[PDB]
Amino acid sequence: KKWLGTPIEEMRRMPRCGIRLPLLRPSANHTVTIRVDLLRAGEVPKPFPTHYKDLWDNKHVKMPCSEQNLYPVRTAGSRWELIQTALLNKFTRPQNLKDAILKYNVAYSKKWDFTALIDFWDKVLEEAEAQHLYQSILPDMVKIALCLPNICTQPIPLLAAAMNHSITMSQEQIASLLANAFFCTFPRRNAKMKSEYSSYPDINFNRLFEGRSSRKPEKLKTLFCYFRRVTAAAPTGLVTFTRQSLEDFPEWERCEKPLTRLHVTYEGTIEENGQGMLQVDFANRFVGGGVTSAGLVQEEIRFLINPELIISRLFTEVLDHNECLIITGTEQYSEYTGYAETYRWSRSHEDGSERDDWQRRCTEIVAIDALHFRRYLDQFVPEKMRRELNKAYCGFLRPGVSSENLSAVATGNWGCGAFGGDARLKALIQILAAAAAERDVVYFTFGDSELMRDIYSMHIFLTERKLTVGDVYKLLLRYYNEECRNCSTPGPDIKLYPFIYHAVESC
Numbered sequence: 001k002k003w004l005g006t007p008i009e010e011m012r013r014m015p016r017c018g019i020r021l022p023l024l025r026p027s028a029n030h031t032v033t034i035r036v037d038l039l040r041a042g043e044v045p046k047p048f049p050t051h052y053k054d055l056w057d058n059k060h061v062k063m064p065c066s067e068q069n070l071y072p073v074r075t076a077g078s079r080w081e082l083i084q085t086a087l088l089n090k091f092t093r094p095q096n097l098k099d100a101i102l103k104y105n106v107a108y109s110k111k112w113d114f115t116a117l118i119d120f121w122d123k124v125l126e127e128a129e130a131q132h133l134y135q136s137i138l139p140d141m142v143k144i145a146l147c148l149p150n151i152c153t154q155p156i157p158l159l160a161a162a163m164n165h166s167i168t169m170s171q172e173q174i175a176s177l178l179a180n181a182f183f184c185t186f187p188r189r190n191a192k193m194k195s196e197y198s199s200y201p202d203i204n205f206n207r208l209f210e211g212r213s214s215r216k217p218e219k220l221k222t223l224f225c226y227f228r229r230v231t232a233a234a235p236t237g238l239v240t241f242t243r244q245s246l247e248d249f250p251e252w253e254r255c256e257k258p259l260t261r262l263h264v265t266y267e268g269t270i271e272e273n274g275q276g277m278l279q280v281d282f283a284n285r286f287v288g289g290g291v292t293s294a295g296l297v298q299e300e301i302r303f304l305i306n307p308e309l310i311i312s313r314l315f316t317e318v319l320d321h322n323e324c325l326i327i328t329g330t331e332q333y334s335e336y337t338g339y340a341e342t343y344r345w346s347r348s349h350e351d352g353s354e355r356d357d358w359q360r361r362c363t364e365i366v367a368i369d370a371l372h373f374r375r376y377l378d379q380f381v382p383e384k385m386r387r388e389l390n391k392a393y394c395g396f397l398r399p400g401v402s403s404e405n406l407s408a409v410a411t412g413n414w415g416c417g418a419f420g421g422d423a424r425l426k427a428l429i430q431i432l433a434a435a436a437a438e439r440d441v442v443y444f445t446f447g448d449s450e451l452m453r454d455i456y457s458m459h460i461f462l463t464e465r466k467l468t469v470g471d472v473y474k475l476l477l478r479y480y481n482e483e484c485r486n487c488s489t490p491g492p493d494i495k496l497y498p499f500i501y502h503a504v505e506s507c
């Protein structure tokens with residue numbers, strides 16, 4: 001009664017069900033920022049190339065340490081030198097850190113509020129904790145940030161719209177980049193009226209420091225736990241970020257594949273109970289959502305407990321309808337309680353995930369953004385349903401991997417919270433997309449036992465009647481036509497699942 005359907009023990013998991021990884025190597029579609037010949041378990045990766053190479057152009061990250069990162073001083077000065085002078089001062093009071101960050105962000109000295117930072121340091125932390133923050137954690141964060149040019153020696157390409165491309169970098173490289181984001185050093189990522197990066201998420205952390213939300217101290221404690229850990233002892237693994245764009249989507253009405261298997265449960269979570277499975281991130285199209293600002297639901301929580309996810313925001317352009325982002329190897333650094341306005345940092349987490357042959361933790365997460373529905377009936381429009389199917393399919397599909405090497409998809413109430421979707425429709429949409437990609441589904445209803453029973457009952461009804469993906473999608477089209485298209489009322493007369501049962505049983 002806590003779970004229904006296929007036992008979870010019968011589902012596929014990594015590393016055990018994967019194909020042997022090819023040799024890690026750079027190519028036209030795979031950027032690798034470390035020495036693959038020198039990659040060894042338990043050893044910090046050596047950057048490749050050995051010495052910094054800079055690109056300052058429209059296809060790459062604009063690094064803070066670039067010699068083309070200038071500031072009008074009536075003449076040009078080196079912003080990297082300015083950052084060095086600003087950050088290498090000792091901090092004893094939160095005003096010190098604010099003044100430091102603003103030295104190289106002068107145009108934002110009246111726009112960026114630091115109230116949350118000041119309050120965290122002065123009004124949440126005990127004296128000993130504040131002292132540890134400014135005597136140890138912050139100066140260590142400064143040093144790894146300022147080592148950037150020795151750590152990230154290779155230009156990082158932007159994962160731009162329509163690119164099918166991967167970047168594999170070390171956890172150490174990510175820590176240095178994230179310390180930079182914390183100190184707000186990334187240029188051209190700040191103007192509200194910016195052109196080049198308007199289609200990219202926020203990366204600099206300035207909005208984490210604003211206002212008086214009671215959740216800011218919990219975000220900051222979660223992030224400082226990470227920074228403490230990665231500056232005290234350099235992490236040794238790698239992380240891969242892959243942008244995936246599909247060209248041909250299924251003719252859904254015509255799909256003759258059968259449904260796959262389902263485990264559905266009202267207990268557990270994606271991140272704890274989906275080990276070795278493709279874990280779904282219920283994303284915003286600007287990946288990470290409000291992680292560095294006010295957001296604190298499913299995506300922001302995952303980005304906080306696995307902060308290596310946050311660096312996706314540096315190089316991942318806003319997802320189009322046919323796109324996703326697949327992140328392999330992020331490490332869990334914190335545990336938490338609650339959710340949204342009750343979210344709290346609990347303690348440091350020791351990740352026991354095994355690493356694959358590329359020294360990546362065996363944790364695969366896919367960012368797929370649902371549509372945000374403002375009116376209930378909107379989501380039943382065929383175009384919108386087909387959009388959600390194609391999005392999930394893109395997230396689930398692994399071109400040229402066979403089904404027996406695909407783990408189950410660990411998912412849940414995608415789009416049915418901040419984004420207003422109907423869980424029962426979305427559940428069926430995910431089940432169809434999983435079918436077409438030939439993966440099983442492990443579905444966590446996050447405490448809703450009725451929804452568990454309902455998803456289970458519908459799935460077994462459809463499976464026992466041998467209804468194909470196409471048969472089911474056609475029933476969704478019928479529901480729209482009979483109950484939604486000509487409905488002038490906000491909510492239809494008959495619900496989806498009852499409609500389906502009656503339509504199938506009536507034929």
Ligand SMILES: Nc1ncnc2c1ncn2[C@@H]1O[C@H](COP(=O)(O)OP(=O)(O)OC[C@H]2O[C@H](O)[C@H](O)[C@@H]2O)[C@@H](O)[C@H]1O
Nearest residue numbers: 269270282283284289297298412413415416417418419446
């Ligand atoms: N750990 C979890 N495991 C399983 N299910 C979960 C978990 N956490 C939450 N749920 C369930 O999943 C439901 C939906 O989680 P939501 O986070 O609202 O995702 P959306 O797709 O609707 O909104 C995405 C936007 O919100 C963010 O800001 C993004 O950046 C986007 O801007 C919850 O109501 C729970 O029932």
